[PDB]
């Protein structure tokens, strides 16, 4: 069919990146809101774009959680990567969490400031990378607007979940997580 120069065929392959789960986190998209970060073959995080709150506490006692050390480390590492990667984050009151019970629950308020200097834009930009591979349908922004992105959701919610084949729109891929490893200390304001 697609025979180039009369002697070569154009052929394809697709890689089954799910087999990389044993050594690296994989991101995957369901519907146009849920995103999952899969860890090993047992757990992971669920990233949900929602119009409902989960935390009205407005505190995030990371140091209490650290002293107790009851949380899964792989999952906390992922949360840290996500959080630290948010550029120009200084609106600490926009973030709250409930790291008690040995569980992970993190809430980012995208309506705290609602232009482009808002923490919401910074949070959505990290989201785009962490869930790269369907994050664009969930964002529901046109292309060429990354610099100033806003969405239809009030909160970005991250909570620990269990393993399931949590995929509809995209295929599991390590790229989002891996890409963020170089951005961990970028776009940080003085204290």
């Amino acid at each position, epitope marked *: 069919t697609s025979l180039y120069k009369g002697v070569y065929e154009l052929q394809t392959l697709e890689l089954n990146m799910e087999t990389l789960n044993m050594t690296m986190p994989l991101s995957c998209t369901k519907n146009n809101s849920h995103h999952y970060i899969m860890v090993g073959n047992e757990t992971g995080l669920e990233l949900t774009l929602t119009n409902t709150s989960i935390i009205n506490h407005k505190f995030c006692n990371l140091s209490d959680a650290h002293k107790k050390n009851l949380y899964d480390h792989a999952l906390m590492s992922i949360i840290s990567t996500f959080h630290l990667s948010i550029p120009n984050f200084n609106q600490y009151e926009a973030m709250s969490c409930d790291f008690n019970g040995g569980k992970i629950s993190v809430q980012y308020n995208l309506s705290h400031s609602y232009h482009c200097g808002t923490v919401a834009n910074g949070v959505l930009q990290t989201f785009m990378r962490m869930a790269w591979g369907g994050s664009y349908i969930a964002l529901d922004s046109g292309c060429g607007n990354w610099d100033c992105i806003m969405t239809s959701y009030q909160y970005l919610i991250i*909570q620990n979940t269990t393993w399931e084949d949590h995929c509809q729109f995209s295929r599991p891929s390590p790229i989002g997580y891996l890409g963020l490893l170089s951005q961990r200390t970028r776009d940080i304001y003085i204290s």
Partner: antibody
Amino acid sequence: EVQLVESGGGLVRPGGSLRLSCAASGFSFSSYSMHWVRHVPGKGLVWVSYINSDGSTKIYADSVKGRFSISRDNAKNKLYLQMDSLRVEDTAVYSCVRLVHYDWSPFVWGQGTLVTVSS
Amino acid sequence: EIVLTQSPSTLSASVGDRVTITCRASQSINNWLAWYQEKPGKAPKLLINKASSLESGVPSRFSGSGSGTEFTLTITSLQPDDFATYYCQQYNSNSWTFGQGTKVDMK
């Protein structure tokens, strides 16, 4: 996902008692206040009671006083409503409602359960 | 201590017709009015909240207004599936008040 699940319904003889409970799951329940609402199919929907997230405020509908006791178990994330001296007019489907003002999806409803008072 | 009144208590309509109902508050409820659609045999469905914010899964033909004491719910073109008793609810007290409801009948 944010969810409220009621249980403990059933048949009560007039003047008897029934304890309802409601399991909260997927959110930081102990930080939120809660309401009980009941539905009588031939009437409109009506409010029953309200409890503050720390339990310091407990209020009831004027039509129901001295019969209901509202409480919360923050450790277990369970909302309770203890009803006594149940009257025939208290027959309704009871359900949990999590109302948050300024939330973009302000009302989280459970499924409810039927409490029937009859002879 | 807030008492809501709906009106007209009954109204009839043709299918596809434009109908409106109202709700009148006593004290102010700001824009914290909610509306419900009650079908026989079913729990009421929340349609609108925050006076005019349409709830998820609710058809675009539904709307509403008000931010003080005068409120409304409207249907741009009534469907066979919209013949229901409609109720208004205020939630500016932590002691919710529901109106008596209005019923849309077919003529």
